[PDB]
Amino acid sequence: PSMSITRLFPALLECFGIVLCGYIAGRANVITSTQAKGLGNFVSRFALPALLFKNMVVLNFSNVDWSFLYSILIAKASVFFIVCVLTLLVASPDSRFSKAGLFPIFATQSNDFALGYPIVEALYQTTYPEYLQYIYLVAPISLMMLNPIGFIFCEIQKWKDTQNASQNKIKIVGLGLLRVLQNPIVFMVFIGIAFNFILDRKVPVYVENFLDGLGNSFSGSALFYLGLTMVGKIKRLKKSAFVVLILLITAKLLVLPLLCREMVELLDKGDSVVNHTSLSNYAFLYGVFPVAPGVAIFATQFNMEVEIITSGMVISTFVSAPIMYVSAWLLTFPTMDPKPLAYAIQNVSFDISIVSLISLIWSLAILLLSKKYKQLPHMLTTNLLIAQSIVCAGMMIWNFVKEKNFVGQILVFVLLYSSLYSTYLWTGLLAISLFLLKKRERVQIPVGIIIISGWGIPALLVGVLLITGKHNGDSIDSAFFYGKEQMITTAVTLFCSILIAGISLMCMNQTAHCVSRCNSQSCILAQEEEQYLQSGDQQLTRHVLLCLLLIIGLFANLSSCLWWLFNQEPGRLYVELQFFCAVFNFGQGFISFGIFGLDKHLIILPFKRRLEFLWNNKDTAEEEIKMTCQQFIHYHRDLCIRNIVKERRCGAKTSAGTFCGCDLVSWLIEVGLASDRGEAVIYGDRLVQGGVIQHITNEYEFRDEYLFYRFLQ
Amino acid sequence: PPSMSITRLFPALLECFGIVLCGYIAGRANVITSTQAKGLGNFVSRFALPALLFKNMVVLNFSNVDWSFLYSILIAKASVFFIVCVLTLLVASPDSRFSKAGLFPIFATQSNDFALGYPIVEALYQTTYPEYLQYIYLVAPISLMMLNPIGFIFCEIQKWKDTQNASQNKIKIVGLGLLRVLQNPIVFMVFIGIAFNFILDRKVPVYVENFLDGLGNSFSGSALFYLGLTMVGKIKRLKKSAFVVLILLITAKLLVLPLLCREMVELLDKGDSVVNHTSLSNYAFLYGVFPVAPGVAIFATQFNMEVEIITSGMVISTFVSAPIMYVSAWLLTFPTMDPKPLAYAIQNVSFDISIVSLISLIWSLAILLLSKKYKQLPHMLTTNLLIAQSIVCAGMMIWNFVKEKNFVGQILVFVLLYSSLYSTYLWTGLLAISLFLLKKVQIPVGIIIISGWGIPALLVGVLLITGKHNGDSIDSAFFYGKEQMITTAVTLFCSILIAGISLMCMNQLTRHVLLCLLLIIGLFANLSSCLWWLFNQEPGRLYVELQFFCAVFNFGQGFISFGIFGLDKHLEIKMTCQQFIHYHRDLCIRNTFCGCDLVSWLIEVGLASDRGEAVIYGDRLVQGGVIQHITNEYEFRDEYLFYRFLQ
Numbered sequence A: 001p002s003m004s005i006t007r008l009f010p011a012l013l014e015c016f017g018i019v020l021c022g023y024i025a026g027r028a029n030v031i032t033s034t035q036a037k038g039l040g041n042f043v044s045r046f047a048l049p050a051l052l053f054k055n056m057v058v059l060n061f062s063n064v065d066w067s068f069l070y071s072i073l074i075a076k077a078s079v080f081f082i083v084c085v086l087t088l089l090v091a092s093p094d095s096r097f098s099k100a101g102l103f104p105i106f107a108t109q110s111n112d113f114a115l116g117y118p119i120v121e122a123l124y125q126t127t128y129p130e131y132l133q134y135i136y137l138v139a140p141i142s143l144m145m146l147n148p149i150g151f152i153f154c155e156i157q158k159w160k161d162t163q164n165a166s167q168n169k170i171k172i173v174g175l176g177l178l179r180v181l182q183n184p185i186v187f188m189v190f191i192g193i194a195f196n197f198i199l200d201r202k203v204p205v206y207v208e209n210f211l212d213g214l215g216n217s218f219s220g221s222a223l224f225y226l227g228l229t230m231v232g233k234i235k236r237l238k239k240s241a242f243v244v245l246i247l248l249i250t251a252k253l254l255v256l257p258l259l260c261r262e263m264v265e266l267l268d269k270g271d272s273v274v275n276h277t278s279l280s281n282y283a284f285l286y287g288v289f290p291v292a293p294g295v296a297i298f299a300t301q302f303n304m305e306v307e308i309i310t311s312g313m314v315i316s317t318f319v320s321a322p323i324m325y326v327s328a329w330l331l332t333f334p335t336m337d338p339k340p341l342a343y344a345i346q347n348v349s350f351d352i353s354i355v356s357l358i359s360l361i362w363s364l365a366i367l368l369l370s371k372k373y374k375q376l377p378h379m380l381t382t383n384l385l386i387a388q389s390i391v392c393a394g395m396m397i398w399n400f401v402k403e404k405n406f407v408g409q410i411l412v413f414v415l416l417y418s419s420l421y422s423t424y425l426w427t428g429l430l431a432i433s434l435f436l437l438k439k440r441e442r443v444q445i446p447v448g449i450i451i452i453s454g455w456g457i458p459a460l461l462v463g464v465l466l467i468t469g470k471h472n473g474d475s476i477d478s479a480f481f482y483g484k485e486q487m488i489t490t491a492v493t494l495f496c497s498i499l500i501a502g503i504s505l506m507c508m509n510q511t512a513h514c515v516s517r518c519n520s521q522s523c524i525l526a527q528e529e530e531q532y533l534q535s536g537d538q539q540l541t542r543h544v545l546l547c548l549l550l551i552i553g554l555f556a557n558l559s560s561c562l563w564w565l566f567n568q569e570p571g572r573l574y575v576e577l578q579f580f581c582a583v584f585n586f587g588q589g590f591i592s593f594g595i596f597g598l599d600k601h602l603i604i605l606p607f608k609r610r611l612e613f614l615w616n617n618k619d620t621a622e623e624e625i626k627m628t629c630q631q632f633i634h635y636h637r638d639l640c641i642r643n644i645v646k647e648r649r650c651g652a653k654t655s656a657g658t659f660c661g662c663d664l665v666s667w668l669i670e671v672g673l674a675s676d677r678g679e680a681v682i683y684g685d686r687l688v689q690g691g692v693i694q695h696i697t698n699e700y701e702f703r704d705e706y707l708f709y710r711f712l713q
Numbered sequence B: 001p002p003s004m005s006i007t008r009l010f011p012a013l014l015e016c017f018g019i020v021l022c023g024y025i026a027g028r029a030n031v032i033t034s035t036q037a038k039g040l041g042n043f044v045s046r047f048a049l050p051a052l053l054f055k056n057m058v059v060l061n062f063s064n065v066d067w068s069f070l071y072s073i074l075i076a077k078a079s080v081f082f083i084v085c086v087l088t089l090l091v092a093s094p095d096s097r098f099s100k101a102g103l104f105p106i107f108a109t110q111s112n113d114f115a116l117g118y119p120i121v122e123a124l125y126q127t128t129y130p131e132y133l134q135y136i137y138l139v140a141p142i143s144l145m146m147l148n149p150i151g152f153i154f155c156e157i158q159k160w161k162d163t164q165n166a167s168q169n170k171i172k173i174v175g176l177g178l179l180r181v182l183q184n185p186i187v188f189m190v191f192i193g194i195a196f197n198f199i200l201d202r203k204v205p206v207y208v209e210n211f212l213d214g215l216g217n218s219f220s221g222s223a224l225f226y227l228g229l230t231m232v233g234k235i236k237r238l239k240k241s242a243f244v245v246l247i248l249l250i251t252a253k254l255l256v257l258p259l260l261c262r263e264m265v266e267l268l269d270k271g272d273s274v275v276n277h278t279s280l281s282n283y284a285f286l287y288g289v290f291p292v293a294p295g296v297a298i299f300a301t302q303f304n305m306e307v308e309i310i311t312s313g314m315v316i317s318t319f320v321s322a323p324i325m326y327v328s329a330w331l332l333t334f335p336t337m338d339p340k341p342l343a344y345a346i347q348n349v350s351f352d353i354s355i356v357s358l359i360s361l362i363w364s365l366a367i368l369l370l371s372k373k374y375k376q377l378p379h380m381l382t383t384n385l386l387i388a389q390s391i392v393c394a395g396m397m398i399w400n401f402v403k404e405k406n407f408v409g410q411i412l413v414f415v416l417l418y419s420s421l422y423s424t425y426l427w428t429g430l431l432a433i434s435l436f437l438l439k440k441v442q443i444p445v446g447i448i449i450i451s452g453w454g455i456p457a458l459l460v461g462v463l464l465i466t467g468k469h470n471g472d473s474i475d476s477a478f479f480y481g482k483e484q485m486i487t488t489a490v491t492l493f494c495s496i497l498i499a500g501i502s503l504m505c506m507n508q509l510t511r512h513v514l515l516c517l518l519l520i521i522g523l524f525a526n527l528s529s530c531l532w533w534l535f536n537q538e539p540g541r542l543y544v545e546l547q548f549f550c551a552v553f554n555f556g557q558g559f560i561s562f563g564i565f566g567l568d569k570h571l572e573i574k575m576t577c578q579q580f581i582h583y584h585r586d587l588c589i590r591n592t593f594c595g596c597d598l599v600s601w602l603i604e605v606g607l608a609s610d611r612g613e614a615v616i617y618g619d620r621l622v623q624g625g626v627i628q629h630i631t632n633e634y635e636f637r638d639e640y641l642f643y644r645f646l647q
C-alpha cells in the first residue's frame, strides 16, 4: 500500500506517550511551571533552528513537487478567508478584529514539526520519503504567507484599543511583518535556504555531527514540553465559548483537511493515478495535524483570547489523536480485499484493547487501592470499569482464538459479549443513578438490583442468544459469529440503554482559648471542612461527562447495527461504521482512563498512606527546607498573613491560628514568593516539613484545598 | 584498516564540546537561569537516561560479551579506588578525613560516559567494531553498583562523626548507603532492564519501541546541553592545598586510571588475535580518560561535603578531557602506520586544531578590541600575542593547502607562518619580563612591538640567508633544514630564560599571569622536543610523539587564549513592580545602592532565585521605571556601582 499503516499506532504511542509523560511529570510537580521554561527555550531556540538548518541545507529544490505546496497553500488561504469573513461579520463589535486575527490562525496552523513529523516518518519512510520535506516547506511558508494577515489584524485591534490621531497603516503592517520575521522558524529558514544556495547541499562534516546531535533532541523533547505546557489549561467555558471552540476544531480538523484533499485532487497533474491518490491522502492527513502550540504563545504575546485559544490547542491535540487514527485507517481501507479488511480491523481492535486494558488496570488499581470505590456512584463506575476491562481481555483472547473450534469458542464469545452488554447497560445504569441522586437526597437506589441488573440482564441476554441461533459460519468478527439473531440481540440490548441514556440526562438537566490542636468542639471548623470534603469526592460532573462520551459511541453502535438490519448493504458505507464500532467498543477504556485514571485525587492522599504503610512495614523492628523556613519566619511572618491566618470562635474555644490553603497559595502567588499554584504548594509542603505549618487536627496533609491549617509557632 | 575511526573523532568532539559550549553561553547570557535548568536536568535524568538504559540493555546480549575485559576495568577502577582511599586516609585533617576519603576516590573512578563518552565511542567504533558500544552500558552500571557503596559508607561515617550517638553496629550506615545507591535511576533501571531482558527474548515490544527510541534519542544532545548549563559559575579561586589536591585528583582520573586500565587489560585479557587485544587495550585507555561524571557533583551536594572542590574538579576535568582524549587517541592510533602517513596525520590534526583555534582567536581578539581592552597595555600585550597566534594558525592552514607545491609561494607561506610562530614564542618570552615591568616605571610600546614582529623577522632573515629548503618536506619544522631548526631552537632557547629570569622578578592581571605561565610550560615542552631532535637524532617511535605534541601546542595555544579571555564577565513587568512597592520597598532595602548589594538582598529575601535571576529582576525593574543608575549612564549589573531608586 501507499502508507505503512501498521506502524502508525506505535508512532502515535510515541507521539502522545511522551506528551502524557510530559503531563504526569508536570502534574506530579516533578517539573514546575518555571522549570518548564528552560526546556521550552532549549527546544525553541537551539533544537528547532538546528533541525530546520540541517533539514533544508540538504534539501533539493529542483526535485520538489510545487503543485502539492500550491494546493496546500490555497486550501489554507481559502479556509483562512472563510473564517476571517465569517468572524468579521458576526463577532462582537468591541473585539471583532481580535477574534478575526487569531481564529484563522488557529484553523490553519498545524503542529507538524513536533507531532506531524514522527507520524509522517512512520507512515512515509519506506514508500514516499519525499513527503517528509513538505513539513519543513509548507509550515514555514504558510508561517509567513498567512500569519502576517492575522498579525496586522491584531495590530488593528490593539490600535482600536489605543486609538490616536493616526490615519496611515504602514506602521502596523511593518510591526506585523517584523513579528513574523522575528520568529526563529522564519529567519532560520531564510538562513538555511541562503546557505543551501551558498553550498551544494553538503553540510560541512565539522558541523554535521553537532547539528545532528542538537536536532535529534527536538522531537521527544518538544513532545515532553508540549505535555508540560498542557497542564492546567482547559477550564470551564461559557456555552458561547463551547460552540465557538466546536466550530474552530471542526474548521481545523474537519474543514481544512477536506479542503486540502479537494485542492490536491483538483490541482495535481501527476500521470500516475496511484501517486495521485497517495498525494491526496497525504494532504488530507497533513490537514488533520493538531493546532500548533505557537498559536497560544502568539495569543499571550498579544494578550487577547488567551484562555480560549489555549484550551482550543489542548483539546485539538486530544481530538487529533483519535481523529488521525480513524482517518488514516479510513484512507487505507479502500485498497484491500474484505478478508484483509477483517484482518486489519481485528489487528486495530487488538492493539486498542491492549493499550486500553493497560490503562484500565492502572485506573482500577488506583480506585481499589485508594478505598474510594466504597461509596455508591464510585462503586457503580467501578463496576463499569471492571466490565470495560473484561471486554478488553475478551477481545485479546478472541484475537488469539479467532477461527478455532467451537468448544472454547463458547466460553470466549460469552466472556466477550457479556462484558460488552455489561458496559452497554451500565452506561444507562449510571445515567439513572445520576438522575435519581439529583432528583433527591437519600434516594433508596437499591444497589443490589442495579448490580444484578447491569451484570445479570446481560447474562440472560447472552444466554438466550446462545440457546438459539445458527452459530455455524466461518465468521471472523465477533458481531457475526452467531448470525442475524446475534445482531438482532445486540440491537435491542443496545437500544434500551440509549433509551435509558436518552431520558435520564434530560431530567438530569431538568433537576439541575487554644493555639495547638483543638478539641472536636474547639476544632468544630475542622469538622466543617471535613464534612465539606466528604461532600466532595463524588465527582458527579465527571460521571455525567463519562456518560455523554459513552452515549456518543452508543449512538454510533445503534446506527451501525440498524444499518445492517434495515439497509442490509455494505456498499463501503458499512465498513467504516464497522471500523468505528470496533474502535469504540474496545476503546472505551481510553475515555474511562482519561476521565478517571488520572484526576486531582491521587496526588498526596493515597501517596501519603502508601508511604506510611511502606515505613510501617519496617517500623516494627527498624537543609534547603531549613533555609526556606528561615526565610519565611524572618521575612514573611509579619506580612499579610496576619489577616490570611484567622479562625472564628469555634463554639466556645478557637485556635485563632489557622489559615486556608487556597488562600495561602493565592497569597504566595500574589506576593511572588512562588511562581504559580504548583510552586506555591511545593513551598507549603516544604514549610510543613519544617515544622512551621500543620493542620489544626493533623488529619490531612497540606494541599490546595478548602482545608484549614494551623501556623504553629 | 585502523582499529578506531580516528578521522571521525574530531567532529564528534566538536559535536559534544560544541553543544556543551551551547549550554554554556545559553546559561552565561541568562537565557536559561539556574532554576530554569532544573527542568532540563529532571527530563534528562528521570525520563531520557532511564529510557536509554532500558532500551539499550533489554536488547543487550549477555551471552556475547567479552567478560574478561569488563572484569579488567572493574579491577583497575577498584585498584585506583583502593590507592586513593588509603592515601587520603593516611594524610588528611582528622575533622573531615572520612568525607575526603569518601568523595575523592569516586571522583577518580566515575566517568561521564553516558553523555560524553558514548558519542565519542560511537564515532570511534561504529563502522569497524560495534561490540565496543555495549561495554559503556556494562562498565558504568556495574561500577556504580560495586564501587560507590564504599564511599557512601565513608560519607555516612563522617556524618556519624558529626552526629555521634551511643550506637556501635554499622548495619545502619551500610543499609543507608545501599538504599541510597539503589535509589538512583542508573542502578534500579539496570535491574529492571536485566529482568525484562530475561523475561523477554531481547525484543522490545513494537508498541513501546518507538516510544523508547523517541525518549532516548533526545538524551545525548540534551545531556550535553545540561552539562554545559551546569558548567557556568562553578570554577572559582582555590587555595594552594586545594590546588594541589585538585591537580592530583585530576591526574589520577585522566592519567593514572587509563594507564592502569591498559595494564590490567594486557594482563587479564587472553585474546588469541593480537589486533583485537591491541584495539581493546586502546579502548581501555580511551575509557580511562573520560571526564568526571556530573553525578559526583550531585553526590557532593547531597552529602553537603566539599561541594566546591568536587564541582571545580568535574568542570576542569571536562575541560581537560577533550585535549587529552584527542592527543591520546591520536597517539594510540599512531604506531600502526608508515612514517609518511604519521606526518600527514600530524598535518591534518594541526589543520583542524588551527581552523577551530582561528575561529576562537577571531572571538578572543573581538573580545579585546570591541571592549577596548587591547588599548590598555596589559591587554595590549595579550592582543598582539593573540594576533600572532591567529596568523600562525592561518599560516598553518595555508601551509596545508600549499604543501609540496611551487616554491614561489611555498617560501611566502613559510615566512608568513614562521614569522608569526617565532613571534608567538618571542612574545610570551619577553611578555614575562614585560608583566614584571607592568606590575612593578616606563614601558616603550614601540620596542616591544618591533621586538615581537622585528626580531622574529630577524631570525627569519638570518635563517633564509643560510638554509636548505631545496627538498620538499610536508612538515614545516624541517622544511628549511637544521639551520631553520637550530634557529627554532635559539628562539626557544632565548625565550625560556628570558621568561625564566622574569619569574625571578614575578615572585622573587592574574589572568595574564596564568596565560604567561601556561604558554611558558608549553614553550618548555617545545624546547625539550627541539633539544631531543638536535642532539639525540633518533626517532625511536618517540620523536613522532614529541613532534605531534609540539604540533598540537604550537597551533593550539589559541584554544587556551580564548578559553581564558574569550569568556569574561566584563562582556509583563508592571505586576512585579507593583508587588515590589507593596511588600518589599519598606523592607530592609531602605536600610543609591550597590548593585551587588541589592542583588544579594533579593537573594536573601527570596524574591529571586540566584544571581542570574536577581540581575534579571533588577533589569526588569529598570525597565519598570523603579531602579535607575545615579546618572543613567549605565545599565543594571552585578558590580559595585551606585544606582538610584527613582521614586
Ligand SMILES: CCCCCCCCCCCCCCCCCC(=O)OC[C@H](COP(=O)([O-])OCC[N+](C)(C)C)OC(=O)CCCCCCCCCCCCCCCCC
Pocket (backbone or CB within 6 Å): A204, A205, A206, A207, B348, B351, B355, B356, B359
Ligand atoms: C554573521 C556572523 C555569525 C555567523 C558566523 C560567520 C559566518 C558563517 C561562517 C563563514 C561563512 C561560511 C563558510 C563555510 C562554507 C564555505 C567554506 C567551506 O566549505 O569550508 C570547508 C572547510 C573544510 O575544509 P575542506 O572542505 O578543505 O576539507 C578538507 C579537510 N581535510 C584537509 C582535513 C581533509 O571548512 C569548513 O568545514 C567550514 C567552516 C566550519 C567551521 C568549523 C567549526 C568552527 C566552530 C564555529 C563555526 C561557526 C559558528 C557560527 C556561530 C554563529 C552564531 C553565533
Ligand SMILES: CCCCCCCCCCCCCCCCCC(=O)OC[C@H](COP(=O)([O-])OCC[N+](C)(C)C)OC(=O)CCCCCCCCCCCCCCCCC
Pocket (backbone or CB within 6 Å): A347, A348, A350, A351, A354, A355, A358, B205, B206, B207, B208
Ligand atoms: C509495577 C507496576 C507498574 C508496572 C506496569 C505494569 C507491569 C509491566 C507491564 C505488564 C507485564 C509485562 C508484559 C509484557 C511481557 C509479556 C507480553 C509481551 O511482551 O507480549 C507482546 C504483547 C503484544 O502482543 P504480540 O506481540 O502478539 O503483538 C502482535 C500484534 N499484532 C497481531 C496486531 C501484530 O504485549 C506487548 O507488546 C507488551 C505489553 C503491552 C504494552 C504496550 C504499550 C501500552 C502502553 C502502556 C505501557 C505500560 C506503562 C507502565 C508504566 C509503569 C510506571 C508508571
Ligand SMILES: CCCCCCCC/C=C\CCCCCCCC(=O)O[C@@H](CO)COP(=O)(O)OC[C@H](CO)OC(=O)CCCCCCC/C=C\CCCCCCCC
Pocket (backbone or CB within 6 Å): A013, A016, A017, A020, A024, A027, A028, A029, A030, A355, A358, A359, A362, A593, A598, A602, A603, A607, B192
Ligand atoms: C518492576 C516491574 C515492572 C517495571 C515496568 C517498567 C516500565 C515502567 C518504568 C519504570 C517503573 C518504575 C518507575 C517508577 C518509580 C516510582 C515513581 C515515582 O516515584 O514518581 C514520583 C516522583 O515524585 C511521583 O510522585 P507523586 O507526586 O507521589 O505521584 C503522584 C502522581 C499524581 O498524578 O501520580 C502519577 O501519575 C505518577 C505515576 C504514573 C502513573 C500515570 C499513568 C501512566 C502509567 C500508566 C498507564 C499507561 C497507559 C495509558 C495511556 C497509554 C498511551 C499513552
Ligand SMILES: CCCCCCCC/C=C\CCCCCCCC(=O)O[C@@H](CO)COP(=O)(O)OC[C@H](CO)OC(=O)CCCCCCC/C=C\CCCCCCCC
Pocket (backbone or CB within 6 Å): A191, B014, B017, B018, B021, B025, B028, B029, B031, B356, B359, B360, B363, B571
Ligand atoms: C547571517 C548569515 C550568517 C549567520 C549564520 C547562521 C548560523 C547561526 C544561526 C543564527 C545566528 C544569528 C541568529 C541568532 C540571534 C542573535 C543572538 C541572540 O539574539 O541571542 C541573544 C540571547 O537572547 C544574545 O544574548 P547577548 O546578551 O547579546 O550575549 C551576551 C553573552 C554574554 O557573555 O555573550 C555571549 O557569549 C553570546 C554570544 C555567542 C557568540 C560567541 C561565539 C560562539 C560561536 C562560535 C565560535 C566558538 C569558537 C570556540 C569553540 C569552537 C569549537 C566548539
Ligand SMILES: CCCCCCCCCCCCCCCCCC(=O)OC[C@H](COP(=O)(O)OCCN)OC(=O)CCCCCCCCCCCCCCCCC
Pocket (backbone or CB within 6 Å): A082, A083, A086, A087, A090, A091, A092, A099, A240, A241, A242, A243, A244, A246, A247, A248, A251, A255
Ligand atoms: C455542543 C453544542 C454544539 C452546537 C453546534 C452549533 C452549530 C452552529 C452551526 C451554524 C453556524 C455556522 C458558523 C457561523 C458562525 C455563527 C456564529 C456563532 O456560532 O456564534 C458566534 C459567537 C457568539 O458570540 P456571542 O454570544 O456574541 O458572545 C459575546 C461575548 N463573547 O462569536 C464568537 O465566539 C466569535 C467567532 C464567530 C465566528 C466563528 C467562525 C467559526 C468557523 C466557521 C468555519 C466554517 C468553514 C466551513 C465552510 C464550508 C467548507 C466546505
Ligand SMILES: CCCCCCCCCCCCCCCCCC(=O)OC[C@H](COP(=O)(O)OCCN)OC(=O)CCCCCCCCCCCCCCCCC
Pocket (backbone or CB within 6 Å): A045, A046, A047, A049, A050, A053, A182, A183, A184, A204, A206, A207, A208, A210, A211, B014, B015, B018, B019, B021, B022, B025, B026, B029, B031
Ligand atoms: C561544529 C561547530 C560548533 C560550534 C559551537 C558554538 C557555536 C554554536 C552556535 C551559536 C551558539 C549560540 C550563540 C548565541 C547565544 C545566545 C543564545 C541563542 O542561541 O540565541 C537564541 C536564538 C533565538 O533567536 P533570538 O533572536 O535570540 O530570539 C528571537 C526572539 N523571539 O537562537 C538562534 O537563532 C540559533 C542560535 C543557536 C544555534 C543553534 C543552531 C542554529 C544554526 C547553526 C548552524 C551551524 C553553526 C555554524 C554556522 C553556519 C555556517 C556553516
Ligand SMILES: CCCCCCCCCCCCCCCCCC(=O)OC[C@H](COP(=O)(O)OCCN)OC(=O)CCCCCCCCCCCCCCCCC
Pocket (backbone or CB within 6 Å): A234, A235, A236, A237, A242, A245, A246, A247, A249, A250, A254, A315, A319, A322, A323, A326, A541, A542, A545, A549, A552, A555, A556
Ligand atoms: C457542529 C458540527 C459538529 C460536527 C461533528 C463532527 C465530529 C466531531 C469533530 C470535531 C470535534 C470537536 C470536539 C471539541 C470539544 C470541545 C468541547 C470543550 O471545550 O469541552 C471542554 C471539556 C472540559 O471540561 P471543563 O469544564 O474544562 O472541566 C470540567 C469537566 N468535568 O472537555 C470535553 O468535554 C471534551 C469533549 C471532547 C471529547 C472528544 C470528542 C471526540 C470527537 C472526534 C471523534 C471522532 C469522530 C466522532 C464521530 C461521531 C459519530 C457519532
Ligand SMILES: CCCCCCCCCCCCCCCCCC(=O)OC[C@H](COP(=O)(O)OCCN)OC(=O)CCCCCCCCCCCCCCCCC
Pocket (backbone or CB within 6 Å): A013, A014, A017, A018, A020, A021, A024, A025, A028, A030, B046, B047, B050, B051, B054, B183, B184, B185, B196, B207, B208, B211, B215
Ligand atoms: C508505549 C508506552 C506509553 C506509556 C506512556 C505512559 C507511561 C510511561 C512510563 C512512566 C512515565 C512516568 C511515570 C511516573 C511519573 C512521575 C515522575 C517520574 O518519572 O519519577 C521519577 C523516577 C525517578 O526514579 P525514582 O527512584 O523514583 O527517583 C530517584 C530519586 N532520586 O523516574 C523513573 O523511575 C522513570 C519513569 C519514566 C520512565 C521512562 C522510560 C523508562 C522505561 C519505561 C517504558 C515505558 C513503559 C512501557 C513498558 C515497556 C516494558 C514493559
Ligand SMILES: CCCCCCCCCCCCCCCCCC(=O)OC[C@H](COP(=O)(O)OCCN)OC(=O)CCCCCCCCCCCCCCCCC
Pocket (backbone or CB within 6 Å): B235, B236, B237, B238, B243, B246, B247, B250, B251, B254, B255, B316, B320, B323, B324, B327, B510, B511, B512, B514, B521, B522, B525, B564
Ligand atoms: C603533578 C603531576 C603532573 C602530571 C602531568 C601530566 C598530567 C596531565 C593531565 C592533568 C592536567 C590537568 C590540569 C588541570 C589544572 C587545574 C588548575 C586549577 O584548578 O585551577 C583553577 C583555575 C581557575 O582559577 P580562577 O581563579 O577561577 O580563574 C582566574 C582567571 N584567570 O583554572 C586553571 O588554571 C585551569 C588550568 C587548566 C590547565 C590545562 C592543562 C592542559 C593539559 C592537557 C593538554 C595535553 C597534555 C599537556 C601536558 C603538558 C606537558 C608539558
Ligand SMILES: CC(C)CCC[C@@H](C)[C@H]1CC[C@H]2[C@@H]3CC=C4C[C@@H](OC(=O)CCC(=O)O)CC[C@]4(C)[C@H]3CC[C@]12C
Pocket (backbone or CB within 6 Å): A012, A013, A016, A017, A020, A023, A230, A231, A232, A233, A234, A314, A318, A321, A322, A325, A326, A587, A590, A594, A598, A599
Ligand atoms: C486512537 C487513540 C485512542 C490512540 C491512542 C492515543 C492515546 C495515547 C491518547 C488518546 C486519549 C488521550 C488522553 C485524553 C485526555 C487526557 C486528559 C488530560 O488531562 C486531564 O485530565 C485534563 C486537564 C488538562 O489537560 O489540563 C491529559 C492527557 C490525557 C490523559 C490523554 C493522554 C493520551 C491519550 C490516552
Ligand SMILES: CC(C)CCC[C@@H](C)[C@H]1CC[C@H]2[C@@H]3CC=C4C[C@@H](OC(=O)CCC(=O)O)CC[C@]4(C)[C@H]3CC[C@]12C
Pocket (backbone or CB within 6 Å): A234, A235, A315, A318, A319, A321, A322, A545, A549, A583, A584, A587, A588, A590, A591, A594, A595
Ligand atoms: C478512539 C477513542 C477511544 C477516542 C480516543 C480519545 C479520547 C479517549 C479522548 C479524546 C478527548 C478526551 C477528553 C478531552 C477533555 C477532557 C476534559 C477533562 O476535564 C478537565 O478539564 C479535567 C480537570 C477538571 O476540570 O477537573 C477530563 C478528560 C476529558 C473528558 C478527555 C477524556 C478522554 C478523551 C475523550
Ligand SMILES: CC(C)CCC[C@@H](C)[C@H]1CC[C@H]2[C@@H]3CC=C4C[C@@H](OC(=O)CCC(=O)O)CC[C@]4(C)[C@H]3CC[C@]12C
Pocket (backbone or CB within 6 Å): B013, B014, B017, B018, B021, B024, B231, B232, B233, B234, B235, B319, B322, B323, B324, B326, B327, B353, B356, B556, B559, B562, B563, B564, B567
Ligand atoms: C584538542 C581539542 C582542542 C579538540 C577540540 C575540542 C573543543 C571543542 C574544546 C577544547 C577546548 C574547549 C574549551 C576550553 C575552555 C573553555 C572555557 C570555559 O569557560 C570557563 O573557563 C568557565 C568559567 C565559569 O564558568 O565561570 C567554557 C568552555 C570552553 C569554551 C571549552 C569549550 C570546548 C573546547 C573549545
Ligand SMILES: CC(C)CCC[C@@H](C)[C@H]1CC[C@H]2[C@@H]3CC=C4C[C@@H](OC(=O)CCC(=O)O)CC[C@]4(C)[C@H]3CC[C@]12C
Pocket (backbone or CB within 6 Å): B235, B236, B316, B319, B320, B323, B514, B552, B553, B556, B557, B559, B560, B561, B563, B564, B565, B567, B568, B569
Ligand atoms: C591542547 C590545547 C588545544 C589545549 C586545550 C585545552 C584548553 C583550551 C583548556 C583546558 C582547561 C582550560 C582552563 C580551565 C579553567 C579556566 C579557568 C577560567 O577562569 C574563570 O574562572 C573564568 C571566570 C572568572 O573567574 O572571571 C579561565 C580559563 C581557564 C584557565 C581555562 C583555559 C583553557 C583551558 C586551559
Ligand SMILES: CC(C)CCC[C@@H](C)[C@H]1CC[C@H]2[C@@H]3CC=C4C[C@@H](O)CC[C@]4(C)[C@H]3CC[C@]12C
Pocket (backbone or CB within 6 Å): A383, A386, A414, A415, A416, A418, A419, A451, A455
Ligand atoms: C464468563 C462471562 C459470562 C463473564 C461473567 C463473569 C462473572 C461470573 C463475574 C466476572 C467478574 C465478576 C464481577 C467482578 C467484580 C465485582 C465487583 C464487586 O463489588 C461485586 C461483584 C462483581 C460485580 C463481580 C460479579 C460477577 C462477575 C461479573
